[PDB]
Amino acid sequence: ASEVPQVVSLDPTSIPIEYNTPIHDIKVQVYDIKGGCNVEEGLTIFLVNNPGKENGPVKISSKVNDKQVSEFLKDENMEKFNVKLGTSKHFYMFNDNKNSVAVGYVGCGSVADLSEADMKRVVLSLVTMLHDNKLSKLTVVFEINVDKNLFRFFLETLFYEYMTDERFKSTDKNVNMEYIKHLGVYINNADTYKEEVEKARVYYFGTYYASQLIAAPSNYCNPVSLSNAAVELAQKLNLEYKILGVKELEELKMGAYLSVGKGSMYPNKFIHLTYKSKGDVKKKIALVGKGITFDSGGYNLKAAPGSMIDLMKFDMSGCAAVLGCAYCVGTLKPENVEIHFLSAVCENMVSKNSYRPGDIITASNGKTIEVGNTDAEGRLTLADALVYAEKLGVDYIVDIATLTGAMLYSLGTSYAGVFGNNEELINKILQSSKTSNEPVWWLPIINEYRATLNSKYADINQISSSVKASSIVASLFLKEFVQNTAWAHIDIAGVSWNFKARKPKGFGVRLLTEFVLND
Amino acid sequence: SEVPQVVSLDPTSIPIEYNTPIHDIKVQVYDIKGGCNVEEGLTIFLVNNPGKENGPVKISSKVNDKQVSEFLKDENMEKFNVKLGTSKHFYMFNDNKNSVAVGYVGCGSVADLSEADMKRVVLSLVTMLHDNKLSKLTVVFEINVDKNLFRFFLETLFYEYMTDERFKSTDKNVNMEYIKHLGVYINNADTYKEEVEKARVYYFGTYYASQLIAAPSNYCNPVSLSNAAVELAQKLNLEYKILGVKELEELKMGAYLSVGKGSMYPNKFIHLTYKSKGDVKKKIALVGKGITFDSGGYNLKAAPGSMIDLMKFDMSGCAAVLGCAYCVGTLKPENVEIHFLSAVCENMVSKNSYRPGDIITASNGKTIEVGNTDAEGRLTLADALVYAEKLGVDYIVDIATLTGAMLYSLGTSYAGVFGNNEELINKILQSSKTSNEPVWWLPIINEYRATLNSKYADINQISSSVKASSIVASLFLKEFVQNTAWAHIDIAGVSWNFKARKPKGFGVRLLTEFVLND
Amino acid sequence: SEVPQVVSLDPTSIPIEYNTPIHDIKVQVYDIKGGCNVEEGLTIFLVNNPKENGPVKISSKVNDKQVSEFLKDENMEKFNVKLGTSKHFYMFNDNKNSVAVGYVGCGSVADLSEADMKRVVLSLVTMLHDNKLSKLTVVFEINVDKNLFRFFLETLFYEYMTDERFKSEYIKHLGVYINNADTYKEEVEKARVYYFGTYYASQLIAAPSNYCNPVSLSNAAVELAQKLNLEYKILGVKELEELKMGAYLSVGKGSMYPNKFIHLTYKSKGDVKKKIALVGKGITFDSGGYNLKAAPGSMIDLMKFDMSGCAAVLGCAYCVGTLKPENVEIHFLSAVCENMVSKNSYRPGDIITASNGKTIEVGNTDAEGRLTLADALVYAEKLGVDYIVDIATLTGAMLYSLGTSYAGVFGNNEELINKILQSSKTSNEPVWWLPIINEYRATLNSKYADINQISSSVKASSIVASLFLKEFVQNTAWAHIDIAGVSWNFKARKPKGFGVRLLTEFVLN
Ligand SMILES: CC(C)(C)C(=O)N[C@@H](C(=O)NO)c1ccc(-c2ccsc2)cc1
Ligand SMILES: CC(C)(C)C(=O)N[C@@H](C(=O)NO)c1ccc(-c2ccsc2)cc1
Ligand SMILES: CC(C)(C)C(=O)N[C@@H](C(=O)NO)c1ccc(-c2ccsc2)cc1
Ligand SMILES: [Zn+2]
Ligand SMILES: [Zn+2]
Ligand SMILES: [Zn+2]
Ligand SMILES: [Zn+2]
Ligand SMILES: [Zn+2]
Ligand SMILES: [Zn+2]
């Protein structure tokens, strides 16, 4: 652990991290619907749909072990309500033991197969029922068809969206902040879904942990304070760790990554976490995350309209995703696999010491790079991290980065883009996208654009001249730093931040973890 | 002299190639009378056809080889035309049954090839040298050229042929093999032979400047650039002096010192001196703008089209001046003393940077209000010009990448020259013709001077009302020359070749021709 | 000839003032030797001090004792000669009549430029606008040659005159004391002619585009021709179509006003030894077309000024028609139209054919000037003249090259260019020679048309445009004057009428 440099004594010297969240205090019980539903304290919510019939009437088909509640929820009483996706209603009644209970439903539309996006709409409606209501318990009755993954995704999203980050609140803490202590789930074939519960809780926190890092402002989350948090995480998970400082970075000749950080008051820190199975290692993997704790753009300052320089604390989202994945892996402990978690962390600032547009810098594999734009710094840091990664001698290298703003014009805010040099690896990323329900789409590395990276003086240009297809050109650049290893690149510049909700998504954590686990 | 680093991987000197493959090319000039020997390598005829736009090629000169002569008959050459820029390759066997490669380059129908047209001919020729491993090139001039233009042909051939690979490591051209011999057949070879070594000298001066310019700002900084100058001065036995901050403070160069304040690299003032052996009749001060990187300062280059990634080229004036010092120091003209000056610094954004609105005091006591930190060139030049005049010279000439407006007035081919003395300006225009580096005389319109009147300082750095920044900047510069013939050359538009993505080394030959023929 | 209207309140002609109060001013020129009489009105001494911001000192003997006492060294040294600084005082003379006496500083340089002289006059005019005076007397205690003296009068007349045509008492006597008065007296009535030529052009330029449109501008040209007994011909769309002027006709397609080609002719009585065509750009309003002037700084509200070239030419025709030079034939030409946005407008990308058969690819509809000039130059050369001179508000880049004081001149002939430069010297309308760089010509090579209207990127727009126009003059001495920068006086919010005196001097000499 290094000392975080301060300008004034009021500068914070660590990232506040909440490990023990109220979500971890929730006891989850899973019951089979065949046994009938018991309705007592708290809130009991039925998830209902009506196949084919858009905005069709609500029907409760589950057995309810209470004559009063059963009478209330009979068809004739429910037909005035419809199943419009996201619709919710609260019911109030007395049960067979003369106790007042709260019941209700969330409409799940008229399609039996709910997409990952429509399921998020269902959960958000459910969360609005949790907010502003001091409840001790919530019960959920699944009257829709969900597979194991979508069930887990439901729980993960519930936990994530229910949670409220108050680390930076001082005088504006919510006085009515109270969480349930109990969560009941009624679902058919309950014994097959039980295994998903703790997995979801693990995936929730891995995702929530990343979110905390991303949301943490750059005066809290800087290269030293972020690497320090990585150390603390490794210590709690019994992961091996190594933080490389400028001296060793110099010895390794990482000129590209070092030049990006030259302008910052915070020394570069290269994070290297390792998980190894106790069993014989049958596959080795490196996960590489972009780790810019703040990206001012450098001398190519973000001063253009729509550049959102105030969002630039998000620029270590790739690193956050990787560290979030480290939590999940170190907790679930997969067998026969060795995983490296890597991030070349730095800050891209303006200074007398900054690297300049036009500078020629040498990467750790000896390639000279001409810098055409100081704000294209991510691919420079990744270049050295990718060289470092391949020297580990692994089977797959997967990187994840808020790399290019062009992603918002190509895939937008919902789907991440994946590029690569190996088809089998890309299919596996796409497969893990399905089973994690973190949407990713395969995008091409167009070789014809490679020629536009031909530098007159250096071995290669940092950015293209023609093109404008930045996401693809950046992928071309990165590919030049991976010689003979299966490699994939996940651009999350578009999906990292939830603009509507004004919070990080913790995107990529579940995706990467599913990738590690399912092979 | 010691180059500060942020990290140990930061370079501490500019890589400079002094002996180039071009220097290893043995050059022989033969007279066209007595015919041409075609025996080895690639023989190229430069042909014309005055009259018809694209008339047939007609090889006039005698070829001392029966087989080669039969091939180059008018009958066989009829299908090929003389369009300016075109070229063809030929394969055949000579008299002793040895395979030989012949060809031609079209020089158009016009009997007078201009600076731009000759450049086009050279390019066509260089294309033939590329992607073809040749031990020898022979060029037969079946067109007419003056002696300056012949020198210009060789200069341009040498400059364009040479490839800068100082910053390649994993991607050097493996097929890069230069010729070792160059043959030239031309009429009255006795007179043209003198231009050969003059061309080689002018070439390296230009290429030396180009190397400094192309060098990125992390390699090329105020300390390393001034070290490079010192090394140059040493190889040439020029007197040299590098003024550091402490000296500059004593001289009270507050305008120049302000510009480098935000930089990690200390300011360094380059003062080189050549003196003729005998009686000195003319004293000349050459001043180069030497900003090793121009970020704009707090007036950051952030506007569309400001091309901040090119601003390593903002020391081109200094490079021109140092390049001239090479030529002058090598050619050793008589009856002249020349001072090569450059206020070298770096314009950066920092807690220590000078600010828009700052009032600073030049070394001649004039207080200056800063309106824009990106108009830093004229601030450094101000102190440099005051220093220059204190040397008591006859002519002060500054050269600078000073105003972007030049791209809208003269464009990328012609530099602008401004001045306070018509005689000096005429000499610059004369030097432009003989060096074939095109310059156009632009006026210093005194009506715009009132817009440099400041409410609080003695003078404004920039105008607020008048556009035409090239003229306004000239007006500002004129305020720091009291009673000396002075001229100013703005090369902001011509310094960088945007199409070839490389510098031109513009100004080297111009300044040298100015020196030599005074 | 009938001006179309959208509503009945639309103006159907340009209001023009022919008889100005300047024409009522009686000018007397006296020699400074013999002393100056100060009997009435305002008397102003033009004074320098060759030092900087030095004290005022009056050298001329004044034949009035009271005023002499006022003008004594001890009193005037309280004031300084800083360029454009002025003081004037009211007092009683020997006859106990009210007189005003004062000065205007002319700085510390023995030779005033046209810019300096202008500042002097502006200070003089300020006093005239603030005082009710029947008479102004100006005493020259500075050195001025014949041309600069005429320039002084022209400038004085022009700046003094106030255009009130669109709104809803001048001096009657000008006295001038100057050493060697006799050599200067002939400059007076020439200055009056140059004044109105300049002011007439100013009137056309300042007239908004709803008053000044292609139809009313040509109608005004006709009326001018009739008053001066100049031959005149106005070419309409049918005539222009037959002449295959496709470049020029394309620009006006989107306008509600039919294109009008103005062709005025002055012919001397005797043998014609020189034939000259003067071509003025006549865009009555330039919106930019589909390449609309929408960018910040494009100043679309100024774009009534885009016929300043035509105005300069018509102002010259007044001077030439008045002074009647001998042994010359002058053609006054303008392809007048309006560049507008409409379903009918020409489009960026359109390939259009000029009257010499050259196909043109339009890259920017706001570069419309060179298109109208393309067909005007072709028309001009067919007249078989010795010189073609065009003048035009052609490129905004002129503001970045020479600025607002000097116009640029481009050409294909050295003799012609140096004639314009000499005319610039004698008219004191500053012009600077700029190169037509042949290396830039290749940027106008089109993939589909014979030539490009504009370059994709050469940035040197004034030069690229000049190259374009050069392609439409095949074997005649031709020069192009780009007055886009100098035509409008931004500070004074009015035209300069730039080019009238320049072009007239070119014709007369
Ligand atoms: C502007 C360009 C092409 C250099 C780019 O892709 N910039 C990146 C960047 O600064 N990388 O270091 C960029 C710009 C904007 C975003 C972004 C994403 C959501 S809002 C702004 C993300 C990446
Ligand atoms: C922006 C302005 C008017 C202050 C100016 O003249 N800038 C100079 C400059 O920064 N001088 O120190 C300038 C701007 C752009 C260029 C340029 C030249 C080729 S591309 C950009 C050159 C000089
Ligand atoms: C469109 C461009 C940049 C080629 C140009 O120079 N346009 C001309 C024009 O509209 N010609 O028809 C132009 C633009 C601006 C001005 C101008 C002059 C004083 S303020 C703006 C003048 C001419
Ligand atoms: Zn960036
Ligand atoms: Zn970034
Ligand atoms: Zn600058
Ligand atoms: Zn500069
Ligand atoms: Zn226009
Ligand atoms: Zn126009």
What features would you describe in this structure?
This is part of a larger assembly, with 3 copies of chain A. With 519 residues, chain A is an alpha/beta fold. Chain A folds into 2 domains: 198 residues, Leucine Aminopeptidase, subunit E, domain 1 (3-Layer(aba) Sandwich), CATH 3.40.220.10; 302 residues, Zn peptidases (Aminopeptidase). Helices cover 31% and strands 20% of the residues of chain A. Chain A has 15 helices and 20 strands. In chain A, the strands form 4 sheets. In chain A, strands 7, 8, 9, 10, 11, 14, 15, 16 and 18 form a 9-stranded mixed beta sheet that branches. A 6-stranded mixed beta sheet of chain A has the order 1-6-5-2-4-3. The first copy, chain A, has a 3-stranded mixed beta sheet with strand order 12-13-17. In chain A, helix 7 runs parallel beside helix 10. Chain A is elongated and about 80 Å long. The two termini of chain A are 34 Å apart. Chains in contact: A-B, B-C. The structure holds ligand 4TM (3 copies) and zinc ion (6 copies). One copy of the ligand CC(C)(C)C(=O)N[C@@H](C(=O)NO)c1ccc(-c2ccsc2)cc1 binds next to loops of chain B. It is classed as hydrolase/hydrolase inhibitor.
CATH superfamily of the largest domain in chain A: Zn peptidases
> Describe the biggest sheet of chain A?
9 strands, mixed
Q: State which percent range the strand residues of chain A make up.
A: 15-25%
Helix content of chain A: 25-40%
Assign the CATH topology of the largest domain in chain A: Aminopeptidase
Level-1 CATH class name of the largest domain in chain A: Alpha Beta
Structural class by sheet pairing and helices of chain A: alpha/beta
Question: What is the count of structural domains of chain A?
Answer: 2
Number of helical runs of chain A?
15
Regarding quaternary structure, what we see is part of a larger assembly
Shape of chain A: elongated
The separation of the N and C termini of chain A measures 34 Å
Can you name the CATH architecture of the largest domain in chain A?
Answer: 3-Layer(aba) Sandwich
Alpha carbon gyration radius of chain A:
25 Å
In this entry the ligands are: the ligand CC(C)(C)C(=O)N[C@@H](C(=O)NO)c1ccc(-c2ccsc2)cc1, zinc ion
Number of strands of chain A: 20
Please give the most extensive interface between any two protein chains, plus how many residues each contributes: A-B, 38 and 35 residues
